[PDB]
Short mmCIF file of C-alpha atoms and ligand atoms in Angstrom, two decimals:
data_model
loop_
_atom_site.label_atom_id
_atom_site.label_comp_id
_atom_site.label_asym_id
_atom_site.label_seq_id
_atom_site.Cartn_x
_atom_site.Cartn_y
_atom_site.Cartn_z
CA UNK A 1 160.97 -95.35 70.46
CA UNK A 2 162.57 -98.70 69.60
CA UNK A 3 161.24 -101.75 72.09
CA UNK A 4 164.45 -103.43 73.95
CA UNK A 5 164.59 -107.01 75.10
CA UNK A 6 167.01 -108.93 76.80
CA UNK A 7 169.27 -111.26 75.57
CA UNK A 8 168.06 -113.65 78.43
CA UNK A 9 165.15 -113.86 76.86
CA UNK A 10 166.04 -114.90 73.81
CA UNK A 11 167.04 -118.12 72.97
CA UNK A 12 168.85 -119.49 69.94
CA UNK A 13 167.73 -122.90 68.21
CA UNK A 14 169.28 -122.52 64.45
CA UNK A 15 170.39 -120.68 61.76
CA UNK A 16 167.67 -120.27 58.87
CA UNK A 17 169.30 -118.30 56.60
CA UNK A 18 172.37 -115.46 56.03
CA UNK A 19 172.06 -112.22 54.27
CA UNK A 20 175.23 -109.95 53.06
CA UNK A 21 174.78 -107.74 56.17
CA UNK A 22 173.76 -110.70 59.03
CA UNK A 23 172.63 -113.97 59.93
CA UNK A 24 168.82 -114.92 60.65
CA UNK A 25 168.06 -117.48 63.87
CA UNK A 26 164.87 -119.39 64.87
CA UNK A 27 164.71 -118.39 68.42
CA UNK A 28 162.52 -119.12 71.64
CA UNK A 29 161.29 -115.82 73.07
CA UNK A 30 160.08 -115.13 76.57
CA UNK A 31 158.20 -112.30 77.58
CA UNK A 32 156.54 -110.55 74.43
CA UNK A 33 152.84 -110.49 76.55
CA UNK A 34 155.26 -117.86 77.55
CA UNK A 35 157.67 -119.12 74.94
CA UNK A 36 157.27 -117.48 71.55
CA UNK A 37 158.85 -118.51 68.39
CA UNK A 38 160.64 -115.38 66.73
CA UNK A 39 163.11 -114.83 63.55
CA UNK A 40 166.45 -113.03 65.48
CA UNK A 41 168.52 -110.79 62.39
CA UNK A 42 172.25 -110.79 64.19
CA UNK A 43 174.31 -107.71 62.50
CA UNK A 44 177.75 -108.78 61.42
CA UNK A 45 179.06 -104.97 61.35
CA UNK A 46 179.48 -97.47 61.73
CA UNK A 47 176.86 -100.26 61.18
CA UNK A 48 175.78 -99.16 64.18
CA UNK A 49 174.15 -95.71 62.79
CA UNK A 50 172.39 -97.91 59.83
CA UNK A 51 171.15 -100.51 62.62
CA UNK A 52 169.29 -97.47 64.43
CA UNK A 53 168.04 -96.21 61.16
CA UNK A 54 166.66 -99.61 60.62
CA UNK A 55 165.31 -100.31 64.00
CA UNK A 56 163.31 -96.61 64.25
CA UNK A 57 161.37 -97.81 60.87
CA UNK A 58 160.60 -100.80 61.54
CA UNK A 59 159.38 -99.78 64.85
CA UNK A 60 156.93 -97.30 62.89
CA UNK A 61 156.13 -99.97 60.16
CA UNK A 62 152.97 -101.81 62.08
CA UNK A 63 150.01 -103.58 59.96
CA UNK A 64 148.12 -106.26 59.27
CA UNK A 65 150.39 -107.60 56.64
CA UNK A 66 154.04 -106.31 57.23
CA UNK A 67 155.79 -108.57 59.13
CA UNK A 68 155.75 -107.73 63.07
CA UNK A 69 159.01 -106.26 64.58
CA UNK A 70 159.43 -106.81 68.01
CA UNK A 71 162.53 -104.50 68.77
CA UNK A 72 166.60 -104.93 69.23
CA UNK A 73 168.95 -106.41 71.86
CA UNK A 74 171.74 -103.89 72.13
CA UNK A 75 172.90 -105.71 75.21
CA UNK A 76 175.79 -107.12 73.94
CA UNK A 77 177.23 -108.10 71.04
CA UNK A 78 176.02 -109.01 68.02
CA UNK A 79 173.39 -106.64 67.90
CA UNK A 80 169.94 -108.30 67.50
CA UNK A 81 166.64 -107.61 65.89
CA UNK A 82 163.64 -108.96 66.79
CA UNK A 83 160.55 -110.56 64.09
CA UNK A 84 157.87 -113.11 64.09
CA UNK A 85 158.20 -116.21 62.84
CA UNK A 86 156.37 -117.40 59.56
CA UNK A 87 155.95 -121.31 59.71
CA UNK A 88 155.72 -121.33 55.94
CA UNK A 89 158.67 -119.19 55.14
CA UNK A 90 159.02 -117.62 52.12
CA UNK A 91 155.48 -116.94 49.49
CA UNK A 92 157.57 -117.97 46.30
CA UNK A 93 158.55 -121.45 47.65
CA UNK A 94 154.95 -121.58 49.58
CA UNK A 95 153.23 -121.22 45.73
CA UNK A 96 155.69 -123.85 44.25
CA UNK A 97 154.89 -126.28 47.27
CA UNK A 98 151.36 -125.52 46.61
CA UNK A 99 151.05 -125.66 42.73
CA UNK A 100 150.19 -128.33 40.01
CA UNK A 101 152.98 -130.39 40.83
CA UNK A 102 152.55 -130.68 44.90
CA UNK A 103 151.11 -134.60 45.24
CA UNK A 104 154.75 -135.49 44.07
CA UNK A 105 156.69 -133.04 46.69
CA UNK A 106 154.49 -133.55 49.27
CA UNK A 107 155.60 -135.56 51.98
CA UNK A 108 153.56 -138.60 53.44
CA UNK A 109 152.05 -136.72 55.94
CA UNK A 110 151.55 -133.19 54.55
CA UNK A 111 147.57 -132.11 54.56
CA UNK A 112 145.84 -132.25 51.32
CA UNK A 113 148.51 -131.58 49.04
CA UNK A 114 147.51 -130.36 45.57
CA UNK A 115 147.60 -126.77 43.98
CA UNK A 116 145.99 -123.88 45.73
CA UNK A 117 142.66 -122.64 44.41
CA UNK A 118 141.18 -119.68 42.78
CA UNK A 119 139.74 -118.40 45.97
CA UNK A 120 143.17 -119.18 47.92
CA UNK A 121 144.94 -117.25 44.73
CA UNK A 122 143.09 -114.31 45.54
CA UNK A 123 143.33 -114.49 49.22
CA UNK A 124 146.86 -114.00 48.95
CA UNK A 125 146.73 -111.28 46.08
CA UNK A 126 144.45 -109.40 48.56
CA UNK A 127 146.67 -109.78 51.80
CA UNK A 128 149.87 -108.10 49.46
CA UNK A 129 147.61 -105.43 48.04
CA UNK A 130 146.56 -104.12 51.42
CA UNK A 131 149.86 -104.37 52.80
CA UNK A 132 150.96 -102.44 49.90
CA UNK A 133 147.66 -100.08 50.06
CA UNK A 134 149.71 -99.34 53.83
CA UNK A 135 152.91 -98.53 52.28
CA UNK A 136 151.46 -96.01 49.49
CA UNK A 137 149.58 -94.23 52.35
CA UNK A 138 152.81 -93.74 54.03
CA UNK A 139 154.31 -92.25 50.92
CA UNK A 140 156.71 -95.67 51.73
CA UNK A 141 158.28 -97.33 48.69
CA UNK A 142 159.12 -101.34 48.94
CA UNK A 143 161.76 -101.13 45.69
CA UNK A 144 161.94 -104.86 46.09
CA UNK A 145 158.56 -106.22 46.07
CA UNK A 146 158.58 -109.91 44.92
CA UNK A 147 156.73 -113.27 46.29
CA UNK A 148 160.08 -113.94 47.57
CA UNK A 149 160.00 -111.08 50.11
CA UNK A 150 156.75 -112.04 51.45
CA UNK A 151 155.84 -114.98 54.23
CA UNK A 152 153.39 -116.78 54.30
CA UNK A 153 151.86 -118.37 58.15
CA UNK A 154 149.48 -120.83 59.84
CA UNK A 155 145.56 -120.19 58.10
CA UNK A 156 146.94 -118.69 54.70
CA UNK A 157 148.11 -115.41 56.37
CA UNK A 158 150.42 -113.66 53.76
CA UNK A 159 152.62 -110.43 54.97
CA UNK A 160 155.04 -108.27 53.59
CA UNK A 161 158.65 -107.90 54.28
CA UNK A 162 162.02 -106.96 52.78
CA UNK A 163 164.73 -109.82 53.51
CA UNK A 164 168.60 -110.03 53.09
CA UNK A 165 167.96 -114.24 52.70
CA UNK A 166 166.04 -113.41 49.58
CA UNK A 167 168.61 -111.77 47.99
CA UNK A 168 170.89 -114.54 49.23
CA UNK A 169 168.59 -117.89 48.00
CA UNK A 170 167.29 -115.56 44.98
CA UNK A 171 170.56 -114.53 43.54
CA UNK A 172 169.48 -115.43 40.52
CA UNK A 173 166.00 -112.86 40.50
CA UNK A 174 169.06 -110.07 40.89
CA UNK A 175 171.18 -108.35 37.91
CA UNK A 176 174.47 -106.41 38.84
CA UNK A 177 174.77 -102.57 36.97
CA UNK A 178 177.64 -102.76 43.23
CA UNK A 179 173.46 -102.20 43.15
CA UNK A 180 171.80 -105.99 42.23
CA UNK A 181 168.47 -104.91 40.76
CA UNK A 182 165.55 -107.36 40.26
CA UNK A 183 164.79 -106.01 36.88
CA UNK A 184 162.09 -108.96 36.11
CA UNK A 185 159.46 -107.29 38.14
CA UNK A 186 160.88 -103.89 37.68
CA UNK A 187 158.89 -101.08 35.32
CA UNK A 188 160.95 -99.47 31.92
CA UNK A 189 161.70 -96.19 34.02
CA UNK A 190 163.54 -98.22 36.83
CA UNK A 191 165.28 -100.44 34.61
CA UNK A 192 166.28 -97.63 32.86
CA UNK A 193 166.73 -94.46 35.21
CA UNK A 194 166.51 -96.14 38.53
CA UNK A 195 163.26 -94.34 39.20
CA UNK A 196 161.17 -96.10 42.12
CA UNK A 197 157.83 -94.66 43.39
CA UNK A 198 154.50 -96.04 44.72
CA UNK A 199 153.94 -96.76 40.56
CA UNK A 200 157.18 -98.59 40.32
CA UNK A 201 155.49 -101.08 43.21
CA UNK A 202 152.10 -101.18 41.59
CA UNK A 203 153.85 -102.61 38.47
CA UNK A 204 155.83 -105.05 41.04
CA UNK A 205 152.46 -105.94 42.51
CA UNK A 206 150.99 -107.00 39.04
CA UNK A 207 154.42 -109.27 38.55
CA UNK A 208 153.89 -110.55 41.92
CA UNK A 209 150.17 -111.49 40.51
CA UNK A 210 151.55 -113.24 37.52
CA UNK A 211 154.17 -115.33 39.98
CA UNK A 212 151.00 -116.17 42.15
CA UNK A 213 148.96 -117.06 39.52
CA UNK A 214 152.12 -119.00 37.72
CA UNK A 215 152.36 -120.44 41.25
CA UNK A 216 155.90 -119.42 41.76
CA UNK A 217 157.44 -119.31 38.13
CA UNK A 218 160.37 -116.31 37.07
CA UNK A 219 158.91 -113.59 35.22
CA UNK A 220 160.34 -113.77 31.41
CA UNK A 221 161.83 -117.35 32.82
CA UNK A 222 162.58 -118.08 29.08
CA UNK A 223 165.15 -115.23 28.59
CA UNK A 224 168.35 -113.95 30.16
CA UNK A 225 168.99 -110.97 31.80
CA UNK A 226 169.63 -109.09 29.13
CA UNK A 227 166.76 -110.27 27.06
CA UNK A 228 164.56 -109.47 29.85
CA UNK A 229 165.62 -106.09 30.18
CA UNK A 230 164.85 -105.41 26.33
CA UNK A 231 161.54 -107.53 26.57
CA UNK A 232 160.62 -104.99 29.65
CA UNK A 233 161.69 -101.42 28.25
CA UNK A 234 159.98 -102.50 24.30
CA UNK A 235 156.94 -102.90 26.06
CA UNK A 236 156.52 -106.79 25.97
CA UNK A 237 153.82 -108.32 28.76
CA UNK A 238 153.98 -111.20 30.60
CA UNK A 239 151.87 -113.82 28.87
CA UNK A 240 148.27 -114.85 30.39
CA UNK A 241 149.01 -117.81 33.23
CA UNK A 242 146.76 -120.53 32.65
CA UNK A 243 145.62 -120.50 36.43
CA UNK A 244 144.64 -116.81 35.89
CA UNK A 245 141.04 -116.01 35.41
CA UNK A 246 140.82 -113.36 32.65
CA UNK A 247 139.52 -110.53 34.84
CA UNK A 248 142.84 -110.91 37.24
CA UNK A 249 144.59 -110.28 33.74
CA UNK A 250 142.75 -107.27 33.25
CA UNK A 251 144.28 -106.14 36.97
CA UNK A 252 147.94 -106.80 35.87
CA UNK A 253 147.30 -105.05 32.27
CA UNK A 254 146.12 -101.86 34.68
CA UNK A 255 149.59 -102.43 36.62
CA UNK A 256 151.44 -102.47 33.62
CA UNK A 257 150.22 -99.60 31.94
CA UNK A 258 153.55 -97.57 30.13
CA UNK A 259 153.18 -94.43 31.90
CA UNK A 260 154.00 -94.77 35.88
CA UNK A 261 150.55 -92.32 36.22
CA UNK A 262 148.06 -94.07 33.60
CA UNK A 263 148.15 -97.01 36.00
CA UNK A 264 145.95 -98.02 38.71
CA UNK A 265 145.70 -96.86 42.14
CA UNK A 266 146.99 -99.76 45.05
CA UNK A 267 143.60 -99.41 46.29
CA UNK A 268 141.68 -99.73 43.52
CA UNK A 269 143.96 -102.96 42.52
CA UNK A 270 142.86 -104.34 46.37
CA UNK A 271 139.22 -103.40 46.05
CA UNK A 272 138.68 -105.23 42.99
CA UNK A 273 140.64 -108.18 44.24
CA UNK A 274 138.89 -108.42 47.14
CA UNK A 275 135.12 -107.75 45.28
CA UNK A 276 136.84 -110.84 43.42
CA UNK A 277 137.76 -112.70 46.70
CA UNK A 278 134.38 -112.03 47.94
CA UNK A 279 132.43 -113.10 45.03
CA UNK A 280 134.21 -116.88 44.93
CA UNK A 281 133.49 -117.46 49.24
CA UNK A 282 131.02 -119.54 48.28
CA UNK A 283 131.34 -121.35 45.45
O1 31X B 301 167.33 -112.10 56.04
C1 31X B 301 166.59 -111.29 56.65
O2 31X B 301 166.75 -110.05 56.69
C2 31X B 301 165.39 -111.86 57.33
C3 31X B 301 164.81 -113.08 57.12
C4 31X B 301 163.58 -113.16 57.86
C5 31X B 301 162.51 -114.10 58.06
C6 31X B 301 162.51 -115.47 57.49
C7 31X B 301 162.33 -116.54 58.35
C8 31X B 301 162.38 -117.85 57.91
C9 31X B 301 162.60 -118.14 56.60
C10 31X B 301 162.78 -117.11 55.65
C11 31X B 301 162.99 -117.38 54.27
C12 31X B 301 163.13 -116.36 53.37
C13 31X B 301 163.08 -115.03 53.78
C14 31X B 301 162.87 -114.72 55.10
C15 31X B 301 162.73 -115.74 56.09
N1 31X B 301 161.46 -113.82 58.85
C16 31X B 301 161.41 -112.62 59.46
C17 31X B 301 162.38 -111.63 59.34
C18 31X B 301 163.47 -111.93 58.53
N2 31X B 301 164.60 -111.15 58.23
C19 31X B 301 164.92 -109.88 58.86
C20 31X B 301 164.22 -108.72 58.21
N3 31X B 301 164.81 -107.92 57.38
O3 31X B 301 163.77 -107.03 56.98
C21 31X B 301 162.68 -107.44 57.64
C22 31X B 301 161.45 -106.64 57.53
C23 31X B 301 160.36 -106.88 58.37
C24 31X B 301 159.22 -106.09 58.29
C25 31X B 301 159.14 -105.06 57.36
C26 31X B 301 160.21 -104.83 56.51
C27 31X B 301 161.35 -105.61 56.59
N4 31X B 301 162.89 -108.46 58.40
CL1 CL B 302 142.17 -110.35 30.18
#
């Protein structure tokens, strides 16, 4: 059910980024109804079985905010995947480029650099939730939902993705018990059983809140790993960011709730983010 193109077609420009299991290319693209900019994953691996594993649900992965897959290139070797290309890159450096300190790393032509708004905030909440409100419906669960796997494109468009440069760039969001866990935005019962569910990503989603609303910052960026981890499972929350309106609080306290079913719904979290979103259009 996987789309093929061929390597023709695509053409290489420059390396972006390398995970553990390949390298990521900016590519030019032609034919995807004409020269398209795309994000090419070449496999460095057997592998082979994993790669088709990968490609079939990715294939069946289509929304609004998951990052589009466009199919393989099995003509040849390496063996290529296919993605769109998010001129922004990554949401976690996005919100740093975009927070209270972006008049001094803005460059000299850069449009109207300053920190992102309240309205902008929760356009970008919004666009995770519903890609996440997809996922639950699916019975999918992320595992590794962060700012950092997210991209950000052209008009504020925010989508969902899972990448092997985040673990790479991030290394640092990851704790080795090899399985490299990012236990900052991870609930007590995942830290300390290794149980993920759609309520394991709900909690993720209200650390992903915080990091918007911090405009990029670590959760528990004060403590080590180890503090963290006891900070988490005691039941410790992630102070109030100063950019966050109380009522977005209220959102991350209903993420954060001890007991994986006392907290809220995905959709519930979207619809009052967007009733929030929609009640700030105008002023
Ligand atoms: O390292 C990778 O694996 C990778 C990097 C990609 C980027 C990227 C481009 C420019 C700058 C970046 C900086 C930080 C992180 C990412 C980027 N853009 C697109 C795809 C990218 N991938 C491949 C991939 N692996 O999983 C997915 C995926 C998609 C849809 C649903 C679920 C998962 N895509
Ligand atoms: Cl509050």
């Amino acid at each position: 059910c996987v789309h093929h193109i061929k390597r023709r077609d695509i053409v290489l420009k420059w390396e972006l980024g390398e995970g553990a299991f390949g390298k990521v290319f900016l590519a030019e693209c032609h034919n995807l109804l004409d020269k398209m900019l795309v994000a090419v994953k070449a496999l460095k691996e057997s592998a082979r079985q994993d790669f088709q594993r990968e490609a079939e649900l990715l294939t069946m992965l289509q929304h609004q905010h998951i990052v589009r897959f466009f199919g393989v290139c099995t003509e040849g070797r390496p063996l290529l995947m296919v993605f769109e290309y998010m001129r922004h890159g990554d949401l976690n450096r996005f919100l740093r480029s975009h927070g209270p300190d972006a008049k001094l790393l803005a460059g000299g032509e850069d449009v109207a650099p300053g920190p992102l708004g309240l309205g902008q905030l929760l356009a970008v909440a919004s666009q995770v939730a519903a890609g996440m409100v997809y996922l639950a419906g699916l019975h999918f669960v992320h595992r590794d939902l962060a700012t950092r796997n997210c991209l950000v494109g052209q008009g504020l468009v925010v989508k969902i993705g899972d990448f092997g440069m985040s673990r790479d760039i991030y290394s640092t969001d990851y704790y080795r018990v090899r399985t490299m866990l990012p236990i900052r935005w991870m609930p007590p019962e995942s830290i300390l059983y290794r149980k993920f569910t759609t309520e394991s990503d709900v909690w993720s989603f209200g650390v992903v809140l915080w990091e918007i609303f911090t405009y990029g910052k670590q959760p528990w960026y004060q403590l080590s790993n180890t503090e963290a981890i006891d900070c988490i499972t005691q039941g410790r929350e992630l102070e109030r960011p100063r950019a966050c309106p109380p009522e977005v609080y209220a959102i991350m306290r209903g993420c954060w709730q001890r007991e994986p079913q006392q907290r809220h719904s995905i959709k519930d979290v979207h619809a009052r983010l967007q009733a929030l979103a929609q009640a700030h259009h105008h002023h």
